[PDB]
Design an enzyme around this catalytic site. Structure first.
Site, PDB file in Angstrom:
ATOM      1  N   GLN A  84       0.651  -1.128   0.104  1.00 64.19           N
ATOM      2  CA  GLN A  84       0.023   0.081  -0.055  1.00 64.19           C
ATOM      3  C   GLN A  84       0.897   1.494  -0.079  1.00 64.19           C
ATOM      4  OE1 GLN A  84      -1.504  -0.793   4.096  1.00 64.19           O
ATOM      5  NE2 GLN A  84      -1.680   1.380   3.939  1.00 64.19           N
TER       6      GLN A  84
ATOM      7  N   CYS B 278      -5.298   0.508   3.848  1.00 64.41           N
ATOM      8  CA  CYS B 278      -5.641  -0.764   4.283  1.00 64.41           C
ATOM      9  C   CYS B 278      -6.890  -1.410   4.061  1.00 64.41           C
ATOM     10  CB  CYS B 278      -5.016  -0.836   5.724  1.00 64.41           C
ATOM     11  SG  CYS B 278      -5.835   0.300   7.155  1.00 64.41           S
TER      12      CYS B 278
ATOM     13  N   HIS C 130      -6.476  -0.663  11.974  1.00 64.79           N
ATOM     14  CA  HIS C 130      -5.791  -1.282  10.590  1.00 64.79           C
ATOM     15  C   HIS C 130      -6.532  -2.350  10.144  1.00 64.79           C
ATOM     16  CE1 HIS C 130      -2.651  -2.284   8.020  1.00 64.79           C
ATOM     17  NE2 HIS C 130      -2.091  -3.331   8.525  1.00 64.79           N
TER      18      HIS C 130
ATOM     19  N   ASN D 138      -1.686  -9.443   5.413  1.00 70.87           N
ATOM     20  CA  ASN D 138      -1.437  -7.614   5.362  1.00 70.87           C
ATOM     21  C   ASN D 138      -1.120  -7.074   4.279  1.00 70.87           C
ATOM     22  OD1 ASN D 138      -1.217  -5.168   6.804  1.00 70.87           O
ATOM     23  ND2 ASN D 138       0.811  -5.744   7.539  1.00 70.87           N
TER      24      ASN D 138
END
Ligand SMILES: *[C@@](O)(C(=O)NCc1ccccc1)[C@H](C[C@@H]1CCNC1=O)NC(=O)[C@H](CC1CC1)n1cccc(NC(=O)OC(C)(C)C)c1=O
Length: 220
Positions: A20, A26, A165, A185
């Protein structure tokens, strides 16, 4: 009875890890990752979906602020309202806020509904990961140990249940009995376990992983 371990990567339902960069997207990566799995289950095609489409188009009407943050649930609702989301290939990621450039000629997926799981219930989260697919979640990642994580089951004594997050639960299991959630992630393939972090499971809603889970579905 639920399986002791699940890994949606073994089922061909998880795309490559994304990076990202300096844009706080996110939430957009979490949302597309959940929908990517449902698209594979419906069509047989594994396709990266456009996080940039969400950043640029699921904006003030959805309570989102692009590179300054947003919600997976309201991202799903944008996809429903908009009647589509473009492929990543056609609408690639730029790590910046841009004018909405959605075009239905590049539509790669739709969404029919989404479901928010009840607060804090890790057993309900386990059932959804086993029976429905990867689940978008928020975690408390505002601790140096999260940035410094390299391997193993992550446990942070100072973690809270207030999440900040957006990530994607793609499985669960145990490492020599230490239970974990397998989390994708969006910090690139060099973070953690080549883009993944295994986070403590059944440790009192650790880091808020079961605080705000949701998953989308696609119409038949
Ligand atoms: C997400 O964690 C992310 O993109 N992280 C990487 C990153 C962090 C900072 C800068 C660039 C990349 C995202 C990070 C937010 C947005 C930018 N700054 C941040 O700290 N987190 C979210 O978008 C998060 C998602 C929810 C499910 C947990 N989120 C959504 C909406 C609002 C906020 N925070 C917020 O408004 O904080 C205050 C301090 C009130 C401005 C938020 O964290």
């Amino acid at each position: 009875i639920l399986p002791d371990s699940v890994d949606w990567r073994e089922k061909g339902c998880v795309t490559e890890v994304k990076y990202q960069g300096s844009c706080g997207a996110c939430w957009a990566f979490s949302a597309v990752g959940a929908l990517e799995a449902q698209l594979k289950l419906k069509t047989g095609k594994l396709v990266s979906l456009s996080a940039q489409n969400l950043v640029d188009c699921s904006t003030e009407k959805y309570g989102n602020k692009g590179c300054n943050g947003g919600f997976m649930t309201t991202a799903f609702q944008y996809i429903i309202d908009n009647k589509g989301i473009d492929s990543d290939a056609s609408y690639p990621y730029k790590a910046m806020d841009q004018k909405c450039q959605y075009d239905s000629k590049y539509r790669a997926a739709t969404c029919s509904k989404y479901t928010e799981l009840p607060y804090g219930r890790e057993d309900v989260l386990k059932e959804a990961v086993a029976n429905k697919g990867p689940v978008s979640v928020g975690v408390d990642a505002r601790h140096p140990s999260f940035f410094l994580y390299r391997s193993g089951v992550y446990y942070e004594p100072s973690c809270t249940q207030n999440v900040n997050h957006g990530v994607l639960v793609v499985g669960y299991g145990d490492l020599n009995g230490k239970e974990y959630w397998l989390v994708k992630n969006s910090w690139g393939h060099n973070f953690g376990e080549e883009g993944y972090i295994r986070m403590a499971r059944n440790k009192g809603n650790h880091c808020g992983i079961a605080s705000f889970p949701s998953y989308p579905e696609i119409a038949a």
